[PDB]
Paper text:
The STAG1 central region consists of HEAT repeats R6-R14 (residues 459–915), and the structure has been determined both alone and in complex with a 40–amino acid residue RAD21 peptide (spanning residues 356–395) to 2.3 and 3.1 Å, respectively (site VI). As is the case for the N-terminal region, the STAG1 structures are very similar to the STAG2 structure (∼1.4 Å RMSD), with no significant changes observed upon binding to the RAD21 peptide. We have designed constructs of STAG1’s N-terminal and central region encompassing interaction regions I and II, and IV, respectively, and obtained crystal structures in both the presence and absence of the corresponding RAD21 peptides.
Residue numbers in the entry: 459 to 546, 550 to 678, 683 to 841, 855 to 911
The structure:
Amino acid sequence: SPNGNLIRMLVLFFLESELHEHAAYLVDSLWESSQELLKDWECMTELLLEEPVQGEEAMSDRQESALIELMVCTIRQAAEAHPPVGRGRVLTAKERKTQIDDRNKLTEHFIITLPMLLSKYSADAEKVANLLQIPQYFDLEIYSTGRMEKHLDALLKQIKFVVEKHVESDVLEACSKTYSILCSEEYTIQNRVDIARSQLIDEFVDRFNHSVEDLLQADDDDIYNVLSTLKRLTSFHNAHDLTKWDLFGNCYRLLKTGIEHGAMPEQIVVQALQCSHYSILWQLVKITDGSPSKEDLLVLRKTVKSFLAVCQQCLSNVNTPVKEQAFMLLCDLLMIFSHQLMTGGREGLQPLVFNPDTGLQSELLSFVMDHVFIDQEANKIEALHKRRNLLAAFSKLIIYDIVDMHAAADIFKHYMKYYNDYGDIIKETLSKT
């Protein structure tokens, strides 16, 4: 493949030079002139899947990662037929025809080759997370049309292998999204994916339940067995309703054990808090869409009240990731279960309304002082945007007077004191320089 040499050098140009920071911007800039080369997906998957021939240099691991990332960018650009975010709308008749044929080409090719790609690179977390961004651009009807049921089985097989081998959050999130996508088209393949997903969840709920009992009744393995299985269940509980498995019960036991004795690892606490939050959100969805009874509402109220106390108690955990996690869920729940919940003819949801007492408001205000306004490279701007999200989620409680909006203003005036006292002098000084 002479196109193979061009693809190889394009990967080299993207890695060796600093002219293009993002792969999506490089693909977009060359899309007008090199669209046919950038859509030779048969050539890209052959470079990734075939072994080097005699006299040919093997691709390094970084070049294979860049080729995968570039390949996914071309898949998006061909399927969506518009530049990526940041570079952005009527398509001509030919462009719409090109999009339909592109969508058909990439769907048939990657329904076959994505299982092969996932199998070869199953251990590489960054590569698998990128490869799992591909099914969202599939024309999923082809699974039934082209009689490609065996390739759906091969994809479901490789996703389960990926879930079983990985604990990274981006990998587990990409697997969860792929399961959600595969159940969003037609019921014949929806039922086949539901069977594979439910069996995958059943196997990890059993392993999680057995690990929780091993831990509470500790070893390094006991800690890993709980954390690793809880990570996969927490990642799937966002997009998948896992309430038929009573996951809140064991998460509550883990959090209560960590509150009394204070020996629970921080990441088990963070995952247990997040998993419990997801369970509550799904329980609210089911209780909202249906016609619940008085017992249904008060059962969820008992659950939310006990979890609000756990999040408040977790604010005193020695580990700051637990504080931030509990604080984010506090600001989330106090906004969801406020009087906002009674909008749109849903006054029957009043028993689910919660008002934070004085002690909780004071502890929420304390977190802002010690963990949002702190004294003291790529992790600095990430922690800054994290603290901004923490303050933004807390500011919504201020606007609607869920917390003491006056006590929060005095905290704001305190940390803005240098700007109100010397800001005018500093502004006009930096202007004339």
